[PDB]
């Protein structure tokens, strides 16, 4: 699924996702505007590593889900990756939430620190009503 912005706004935010471990709801949009456009489906290989990007937030198969082809894959979040990749993203952002639990918080995506951080980042809220 492909989420309009709005939607995706007023979903996180009932999913407490809003100052969660300190980040702002513009902050998580912003990360997944640049991370997979808001697609739920969107999967990146990286054939550096043998690692792979999955879903909304391009979460790693090396540290939080398991996907049984990545070597030294350590499952932090307790979940097949493919639970990455559904409409709903209530897993997503249960993991997410695990992510940003460990020190790095929501610089563990580069993405963010290159298209978020020290930015006017109201733009990806304004006028959702949330």
């Known amino acids: 699924k492909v989420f309009e912005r709005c939607e995706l706004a007023r979903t996180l935010k009932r999913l407490g996702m809003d100052g969660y ?3 702002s709801l513009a902050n998580w949009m912003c990360l997944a505007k640049w991370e997979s456009g808001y697609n739920t489906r ?14 909304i937030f391009q979460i790693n198969s090396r540290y939080w889900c398991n996907d ?14 493919s639970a990455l990749l559904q ?10 939430k695990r992510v940003v639990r460990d020190p790095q918080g929501i ?17 990806y809220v304004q006028g959702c009503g949330v």
């Open 21 to 23: 471990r300190g980040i």
């Open 68 to 81: 049984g082809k990545t070597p030294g894959a350590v499952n932090a979040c307790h979940l097949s990756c």
């Open 42 to 55: 969107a999967t990146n290989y990286n054939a550096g590593d043998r690692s792979t990007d999955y879903g």
């Open 87 to 96: 409409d709903n993203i209530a897993d997503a952002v249960a993991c997410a």
């Open 107 to 123: 610089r563990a995506w580069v993405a963010w620190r290159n298209r978020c951080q020290n930015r006017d980042v109201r733009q």
